[PDB]
């Protein structure tokens, strides 16, 4: 596995896709809604991806629940992460949500969901009800349960967006938001806790500048990714970059330079989404490096959707998640 996560255009692989996936710089494919038509098509696509790579390759997706669920039709709907804490039995429900989400992905030959969100609060429009709560303890109580669910079925976990994206409430009018708070201790406490617990296999940093701490976005900052994340907090897992196709070239250079800089800053792996031309430029021009420790993120269990549906745990979780959505969704009222 190499450092690069890239994506494909549609429901099946093109000839170019099959060629690219063999490249040693590729480590993973991130799937989007545009790669999902139906359950059988998804299984076929994932088989094809793994066959084309001719070595282990990660298949990942943003499948959080609520506003962020790429595969919906023919899957169980998972609620916004916010909903668990709104119910009296929120800890049990959060575990069910994590388990169900992860299990259905595993059953369709996906390695991992980029989850959970450990951001604090609902006031950042991009985050909102993706957060488990608005205070440290509510977020920890419910995210920990969600994590336990994911781990129960052998899915690797990813905390995001380190050191916390919950309070980005102003618009910088630039490509990189700023969070101007003099202290983000509460936000970081959540990440510290989950790292110490040993329950995060990976971390995605925030593309956010925290000027009272450091001048660079966390996702491109040695301060955040090395000094804090590694040395102070003792994180031993995989660090993913921000989506590099998002970064402008006027300051950061072209996609090859941006990839290099992310890796030097402390990322293990880099993401280039929705920009095939950039991904190919990086494959064509980035010196080859291996990320063997990424193999830790490969899913640990194998089962089919038929098998999953025969489990009481599935029958209950699916019913309970639909009911939880119905309890708090404005759409269902």
Ligand X SMILES: CC(=O)N[C@H]1/C(=N/OC(=O)Nc2ccccc2)O[C@H](CO)[C@@H](O)[C@@H]1O
For ligand X, the closer of residues 44 and 246 by Cβ is 246
For ligand X, the closer of residues 36 and 114 by Cβ is 114
Q: Does 126 bind ligand X (CB under 6 A)?
A: yes
Q: Does 246 bind ligand X (CB under 6 A)?
A: yes
Q: Does 276 bind ligand X (CB under 6 A)?
A: no
Cα 232 to Cα 118, 144, 151, 187, 265, distances in angstroms: 19, 21, 25, 16, 16
For ligand X, the closer of residues 30 and 263 by Cβ is 30
* Binding track, positions 181-220, relative to ligand X; x by CB under 6 A: -----------------------x----------------
d(CA 48, CA 29): 12
CB 264 within 8 A of CB 216: no
Look up residue 287 and give its DSSP letter. P
State the angle between helix axes of 255-265 and 276-285 in degrees (0 to 180), rounded to the nearest 10: 70
Active site residue 201: no
For ligand X, the closer of residues 89 and 172 by Cβ is 172
Q: Which residues of 130-163 are buried (b: 16+ CB within 10 A; e: fewer)?
A: bbbbeebebbbbbbbbbbbbbbebbbbbbbbbbb
- Give the start-end residues of each E strand in the chain: 4-6, 26-31, 58-61, 63-65, 68-69, 112-113, 158-162, 202-205, 238-243, 269-271
Q: Does 70 bind ligand X (CB under 6 A)?
A: no
Maximum distance among all Cα pairs of the chain, rounded to whole angstroms = 55
- Among 62, 134, 214, 281, indicate the residue that binds ligand X (CB under 6 A): 62
* Binding track, positions 152-171, relative to ligand X; x by CB under 6 A: --------xx---x------
70 annotated ligand binder: yes
Q: Does 114 bind ligand X (CB under 6 A)?
A: yes
Closest residue to ligand X, judged by C-beta, is 246
State the minimum distance, in angstroms, from the CB of residue 319 to ligand X: 28
Q: Does 298 bind ligand X (CB under 6 A)?
A: no
Residue tagged active-site, from 173, 201, 212, 260:
173
Tokens of 151: 């781990």
3 state DSSP class of 238? strand
Q: Under rule CB under 6 A, how many of the chain's residues touch ligand X?
A: 10
For ligand X, the closer of residues 112 and 317 by Cβ is 112
135 annotated ligand binder: no
State the minimum distance, in angstroms, from the CB of residue 298 to ligand X: 18
State the minimum distance, in angstroms, from the CB of residue 158 to ligand X: 8
130 annotated ligand binder: yes
3 state DSSP class of 331? coil
State the minimum distance, in angstroms, from the CB of residue 104 to ligand X: 18
Residue tagged active-site, from 7, 17, 119, 242:
242
State the angle between helix axes of 136-152 and 90-107 in degrees (0 to 180), rounded to the nearest 10: 40
For ligand X, the closer of residues 70 and 299 by Cβ is 70
Active site residue 37: no
Q: Does 108 bind ligand X (CB under 6 A)?
A: no
DSSP assignment of 121-153: -S-STTTGGGSS-SSHHHHHHHHHHHHHHHHHT
d(CA 317, CA 313): 6
d(CA 292, CA 285): 21
CA 116 to chain CA mean position, Å? 7
Chain contacts with ligand X (rule: CB under 6 A): 62, 114, 126, 160-161, 165, 204, 243, 246, 273
**Which residues are tagged catalytic?**
173, 242
Residues belonging to the binding site for substrate are: 62, 70, 130, 160-161
């Amino acid at each position: 596995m190499g450092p690069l996560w890239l994506d494909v255009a549609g429901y099946e692989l093109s000839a170019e896709d099959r060629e690219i996936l063999q490249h040693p710089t590729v480590g993973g494919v991130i799937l989007f809604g545009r790669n999902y038509h139906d359950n059988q098509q998804l299984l076929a696509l994932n088989k094809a991806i793994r066959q084309a790579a001719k070595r282990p390759i990660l298949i990942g997706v943003d499948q959080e629940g609520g506003r962020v669920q790429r595969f919906r039709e023919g899957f169980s709907r998972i609620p916004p992460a916010q909903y668990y804490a709104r119910a009296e039995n929120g800890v049990e429900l959060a575990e069910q949500g994590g388990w169900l989400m992860a299990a259905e992905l595993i059953a369709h030959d996906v390695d991992l969901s980029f989850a959970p969100v450990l951001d604090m609060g609902f006031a950042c429009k991009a985050i909102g009800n993706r957060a488990f709560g608005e205070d440290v303890q509510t977020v920890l109580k419910h995210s920990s349960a969600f994590l336990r669910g994911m781990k129960a079925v052998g899915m690797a976990t990813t905390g995001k967006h380190f050191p916390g994206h919950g309070a980005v409430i102003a618009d910088s009018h630039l490509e990189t938001p700023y969070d101007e708070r003099e202290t983000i201790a509460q936000d970081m406490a959540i990440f510290r806790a989950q790292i110490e617990a040993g329950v995060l296999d990976a971390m995605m940093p925030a593309h956010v500048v925290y000027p009272h701490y450091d001048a660079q976005p966390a996702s491109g900052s040695s301060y955040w990714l090395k000094q804090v994340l590694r040395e102070e907090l003792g994180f031993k897992g995989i660090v993913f970059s921000d989506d590099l196709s998002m970064e402008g070239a006027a300051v950061m250079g072209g996609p090859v330079e941006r990839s290099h800089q992310a890796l030097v800053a402390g990322c293990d792996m880099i993401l280039i989404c929705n920009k095939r031309e950039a991904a190919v430029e990086v494959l064509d021009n980035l010196p080859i490096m291996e990320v063997p420790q990424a193999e830790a993120l490969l899913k640990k269990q194998q089962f089919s959707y038929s098998e999953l549906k025969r489990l009481e745990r599935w029958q209950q979780a699916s019913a309970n998640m639909q009911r939880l959505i119905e309890q708090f969704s404005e759409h269902h009222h």
